[PDB]
Amino acid sequence: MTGGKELGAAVELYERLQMLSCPCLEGVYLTDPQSIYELLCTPSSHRLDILQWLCSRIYPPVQEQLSSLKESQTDTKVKEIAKLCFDLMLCHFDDLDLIRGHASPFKQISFIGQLLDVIQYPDTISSNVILESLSHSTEKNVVTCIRENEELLKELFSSPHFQATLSPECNPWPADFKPLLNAEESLQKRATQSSKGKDMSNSVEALLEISSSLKALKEECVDLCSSVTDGD
């Protein structure tokens, strides 16, 4: 039940970590969703140094700072990662236990996805632009992004649709369905009284019993299954 969606999302984040070439997976060839979920969701150094690589991919000046911090300074790495993720609008600066791995798995998964999204994919491998002097790259990249954002914001805000996206409503429903859709205080009682994860199971359970009973009756009635079409 439940955790099957947290197991599946751990595989999504793990295959994306391989696509984005995480060196903290070099030789770490897991094929079990439980082991993959535990690598992303349990309190480990392996996971904390993955979170440090994700932080270094998004914001390289943290890589000097976190490599200055030892094994015996890991609970200091945790606070500078949480403080970075707060500055980056991902968690609170005291959200240390999301950074360690004691938070609920869906919160860890949602946090790791919001790191992997910002690590744009290597689609046009521009081989030389990896290590030419960052101190004469960063200000250009800030000005170009400020320009992209001025153009994109000025041309988003020129659209007549630009208040509807910010306040969306939809109605596919024609007149011959609106008596049902107005019957809220009667019909929503049924919609809240269904036990769902039970109801789905008992439906397949009865379908299997009736299929077995129908099979057995046809394996008995074999002579009556003979196509003697000339009955009249």
């Binding site: 800030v142 400020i146 954002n149 914001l153 429903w173 019957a183 919609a191």
Partner: protein, 52 residues
């Protein structure tokens, strides 16, 4: 320039949050509107099965 980019960040994140709160409200009643029509489907399909 640093206050300029952080004025664009505030525009973007304000719009995202304004969308999230109004879009989840549409999705919440859109599922209930589909459920209120699957109630009508189920009973009608089952009545038709007895009549068959």
């Amino acid at each position: 320039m640093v206050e300029m980019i952080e004025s664009q960040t505030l525009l973007l994140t304000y719009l995202t949050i304004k969308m999230q709160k109004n879009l989840f409200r549409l999705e919440e009643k859109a599922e209930r509107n589909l459920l209120l029509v699957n109630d009508q489907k189920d009973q009608l399909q089952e009545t038709i099965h007895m009549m068959k």
